[PDB]
Structure 1
Amino acid sequence: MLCAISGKVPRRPVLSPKSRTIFEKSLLEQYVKDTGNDPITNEPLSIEEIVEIVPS
């Protein structure tokens, strides 16, 4: 329930199908323009496969 990039309480809670944690969209955007990797599995590219946790 805390981000795998930096552990911040998210403003845009976001998941990637490989890592399966919940990170902040903004902190993933940093990591995924750095290397593209998922923060845990290091699978190249993340945001092109993003699951944003909408309030709906």
Structure 2
Amino acid sequence: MLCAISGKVPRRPVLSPKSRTIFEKSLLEQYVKDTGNDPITNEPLSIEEIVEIVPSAQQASSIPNLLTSLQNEWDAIMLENFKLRST
């Protein structure tokens, strides 16, 4: 939840399609107009190369994390069984 130029909370998170790193539209645009480049990797990048605005479309804004939680607790189960068996 942070831009990779200033460090602010991005209200319009745009990303460069050369190095995966979410910037803010204002700062990245000022960097591109300064010199046509990506600020992190110094590769070629333009204004049209940037993907702007939020993405929610045909998606709708639980379940998946329950399975993640089930994994996380099992991860301990295995770690415990090891140290119990060693002894």
TM-score scaled to structure 1, two decimals?
0.78
Runs of 4+ in 1 over 4 A off after TM superposition: none
Measure, in 1, the Cα distance between the counterparts of 2:30 and 2:37: 11
Structure with the higher fraction of residues in helix conformation: 2
Q: Is the Cα contact below 8 Å between 1:35 and 1:44 reproduced in 2? A: no
Q: Percent identity?
A: 98
**How many Å apart are 1:42 and its aligned residue?**
1.0
Structure with the higher fraction of residues in strand conformation: 1
Q: Is the Cα contact below 8 Å between 2:32 and 2:45 reproduced in 1? A: yes
Residue 52 of structure 1 aligns to a residue whose secondary structure is: coil
For the aligned residue pairs, the C-alpha RMSD in angstroms reads 7.0
Measure, in 2, the Cα distance between the counterparts of 1:10 and 1:39: 16
Residue 19 of structure 1 aligns to a residue whose secondary structure is: coil
Q: Any unmatched runs of 5+ in structure 2? A: 55-86
TM-score scaled to structure 2, two decimals?
0.54
Specify the structure having the higher radius of gyration (Cα): 2
Say how many residue pairs are matched: 55
Q: Any unmatched runs of 5+ in structure 1? A: none
**How many Å apart are 1:53 and its aligned residue?**
4.1
Q: Which has the higher contact order (CA 8 A, sep 6+)?
A: 1
